[PDB]
């Protein structure tokens with residue numbers, strides 16, 4: 001065959017849950033996490049640190065995106081299976097990254113081979129140089145066993161077979 | 164030398180159009196998100212070129228029970244229709260929302276409803292998409308506002 005066939009896959013990921021991808025994400029592909037909520041409140045009941053993750057088949061964290069309200073930073077990192085975290089990249093001021101977001105948000109990751117480009121709504125927040133390479137085979141959503149900055153269910157959409 | 168891609172988000176009301184800040188070209192994607200599924204009069208989602216050609220017209224026709232795909236030049240007649248039968252069957256397990264994705268593959272538009280490819284549409288007019296539109300009679304099959312997301316600067 002000569003024509004290009006791409007694919008859309010849709011996943012509902014609860015806080016504290018993971019999904020295995022039916023179509024892996026590789027160079028040229030995209031994943032967007034859609035949240036139907038955004039909670040940036042301080043004080044009692046304030047959200048715990050909340051992460052969205054792209055994992056390889058052996059459980060490496062290819063990209064970990066940790067939104068830390070109290071510390072007021074977004075941390076980007078990677079981690080081999082059963083190993084220490086690698087070198088963090090940080091973006092300061094969580095709320096500033098969600099200006100004009102309203103009551104929902106999206107976090108998009110482009111796999112560009114050597115880098116992951118992360119875009120919050122329309123704003124590129126990092127061109128992250130990869131610390132671990134390879135295909136993404138699962139996604140996960142960690143709210144430190146408690147209150148999340150996002151909706152209880154986040155919808156992940158993958159666009160694959162692009163290249 | 165690095166690739167910089169872009170996400171753009173548009174809120175398109177029924178009977179409205181939006182100009183794209185970043186045009187959709189070969190390798191790019193547009194997804195239309197509806198927060199309702201009303202399965203209502205004929206409803207269309209359109210990709211238009213700078214000169215007002217309909218590069219892709221997607222018409223959902225509930226009563227006729229078909230989805231019609233076509234193109235047309237500015238100020239000119241419609242071209243050759245491609246049809247997909249049974250509208251509801253394309254939205255199996257959709258619930259109360261839906262998404263319609265168009266991949267610009269250069270020679271074809273691949274249209275995917277939720278996860279299901281419904282057509283590999285052979286282009287009848289080529290070129291970049293510079294605007295989107297959403298047509299209906301309050302009788303749309305989709306929500307009054309549809310959110311379009313474009314992914315551009317891919318290739």
Ligand SMILES: CC(=O)N[C@@H]1[C@@H](O)[C@H](O[C@@H]2O[C@H](CO)[C@H](O)[C@H](O[C@H]3O[C@H](CO)[C@H](O)[C@H](O)[C@H]3NC(C)=O)[C@H]2O[C@@H]2O[C@@H](C)[C@@H](O)[C@@H](O)[C@@H]2O)[C@@H](CO)O[C@H]1O
Nearest residue numbers: 048049050051064066067075076077085086088142143144
């Ligand atoms: C200034 C500085 O360098 N600080 C470092 C901290 O940021 C490190 O904290 C960990 O950072 C990781 C990313 O680099 C990651 O976010 C991790 O939390 C996540 O992973 C752990 C297991 O390692 C747990 O599973 C957590 O639940 C999980 N959290 C989320 C939201 O996904 C961070 O570690 C946790 O948070 C910090 C603040 C401490 O409370 C730790 O005890 C927690 O485990 C830190 C360790 O790499 O190193 C510092 O130097």
Ligand SMILES: CC(=O)N[C@@H]1[C@@H](O)[C@H](O[C@@H]2O[C@H](CO)[C@H](O)[C@H](O[C@H]3O[C@H](CO)[C@H](O)[C@H](O)[C@H]3NC(C)=O)[C@H]2O[C@@H]2O[C@@H](C)[C@@H](O)[C@@H](O)[C@@H]2O)[C@@H](CO)O[C@H]1O
Nearest residue numbers: 205206207208220222223231232233241242243244298299
């Ligand atoms: C079997 C066959 O060939 N049938 C043909 C019909 O499908 C043709 O209907 C038009 O089809 C067009 C795509 O090929 C297009 O969907 C069009 O409607 C759209 O464009 C018109 C202007 O031309 C209006 O702007 C409509 O509002 C717009 N529709 C939407 C949803 O945005 C179709 O024409 C309309 O719908 C049909 C069913 C009739 O009611 C027409 O009078 C309407 O104008 C048809 C005409 O090209 O030719 C048949 O042979």
